[PDB]
């Protein structure tokens, strides 16, 4: 069968999603789960102290008045008929680099499609023009034609970045590492028009580790990145100062 | 004087933070800057689309119209005259064990203290019932006295479960990995007052891992659990692996 949960955080009418899904279409069973608009930001976020309406529009995507995480979450537990096999997310509306993942609503969909039988993929197109999603969608259309022939470990989260060009001016695929950005700008505060102050988050911080080896790097000389993302946030490294710290505590 | 920032997921009207604040207050100088609303699954979604808009309540808790993250954010970002040494977020009511993490708001709070720079404690207060805050407003006092003197790395997250128990019921603590969650709750569908159909996440499901070394098995037999956390999302050790998938899926 093959039946792929197609997710994103543009909402359920961006373009990024519909070519993807067309492009999936060919290759087994499509579900699409969808916010119902953008939820840029919204990172692994449910919505849990209220309901979500769900709506089946005339394209036979799903769309769902929630966060990108709710949208995979519901699918898999209930929402769909039948269970989906692997989660794919995307195509996103630009790069989710580096420190960038950690909030990305887009990854959190694909992190959420972990607790199926076969890799999840969070797939985002690069730049702010968005010219060849169809590059970005055949990229994903081989990656899973070969995990079907070459299974990779249970519970792979793959982040996968491809530049905003032609397929044939790609210059490769590379297994990266999350790139890191120097500190965040400060927070803009203003004063509303009834003389409230408000404050923006301010923009990510310049590109600081974007050295050969890193998702920036890749995206920058034209090469699709593919990062692998840990699935366990325990920090093992850690235990031998933390264990004797509190090995110390025990008066 | 040590500088505490602490926030939480609960809002800022909980009590978890209330007992939490005013106990930490005798060990340095306590900024609160807390979601103006529950916000239980925020996960580290941060607000970008908009402006926040803050406020200062009469017992000196700064109210934030946003998520957790947004609090913690925009503290070490302007919103507060001096950078705090460690961000406290909780006590939160209900645990955070294994899965959990991912999409808990008060985990991102302290999250977010960590990566510019601050080292960061994550509380929950085990069960239900929450009868014993006092209980892990002791423990946060405890760990955060003894870090001043035996200093931990200067990076460190911790997420800390404290059981629903006197304080004197507690057999210990324990350095601990994430656990895991068997499969979530259905979700739970029902109509609205005006006939359409709305979905509510289900609750989390049962323990899967759930063994010695585990976070739950230390919370299960009446130990405080204290988990590191990374920072680094990238799985390593998965890379040789990739890489050689990769160069075959090239084939």
Redesign the interface.
Same mark, same amino acid.
């Given at each position: 069968k093959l039946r792929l949960l197609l997710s994103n955080d543009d909402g359920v009418y961006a373009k990024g999603l519909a070519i993807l899904a067309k492009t999936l279409a060919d290759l087994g069973e499509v579900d699409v789960v969808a916010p119902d608009r953008?939820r840029?930001?919204?990172?692994?976020?449910?919505?849990?102290?209220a309901?979500?309406?769900?709506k089946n529009l005339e394209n036979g995507m799903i769309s769902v008045e929630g966060?990108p995480?709710?949208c995979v979450?519901?699918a898999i537990?209930?929402?769909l008929p039948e269970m989906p096999d692997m989660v794919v997310a995307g195509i996103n509306a630009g790069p989710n680099l580096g420190?960038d993942?950690?909030?990305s609503g887009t990854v959190?969909a694909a992190?959420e499609g972990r607790?199926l039988g076969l890799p999840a993929l969070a797939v985002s197109l690069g730049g702010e023009l968005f010219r060849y999603y169809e590059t970005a969608a055949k990229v994903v259309y081989?990656?899973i034609q070969?995990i079907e022939k070459?299974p990779?470990?249970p519970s *792979?989260i793959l982040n996968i970045n491809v530049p905003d060009l032609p397929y044939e001016e790609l210059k490769?695929?590379? #297994?990266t %590492? =999350?790139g890191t950005r120097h500190?965040?700008?400060?927070?803009?505060?203003?004063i509303?028009p009834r003389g409230?102050?408000?404050?923006?988050?301010?923009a990510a911080g310049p590109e600081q580790d974007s050295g050969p080896g890193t998702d920036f790097f890749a995206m920058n000389h034209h090469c699709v990145s593919? *990062?692998?993302?840990?699935?366990?946030?325990?920090?093992?490294?850690?235990?031998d100062?933390?264990?004797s710290? #509190?090995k %110390? =505590?025990?008066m």
């Open positions: 953008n840029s930001g919204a990172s692994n976020s449910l919505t849990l102290n309901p979500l309406h769900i966060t995480t709710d979450h519901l537990t209930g929402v420190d993942v950690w909030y959190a992190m607790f081989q990656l070969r070459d990779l470990p *792979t490769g695929f590379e #297994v %590492r =999350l500190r965040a700008e400060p927070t803009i505060r203003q509303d409230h102050p408000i404050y923006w988050v301010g593919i *990062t692998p993302l840990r699935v366990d946030l325990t920090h093992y490294e850690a235990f100062q933390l264990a710290w #509190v %110390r =505590l025990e």
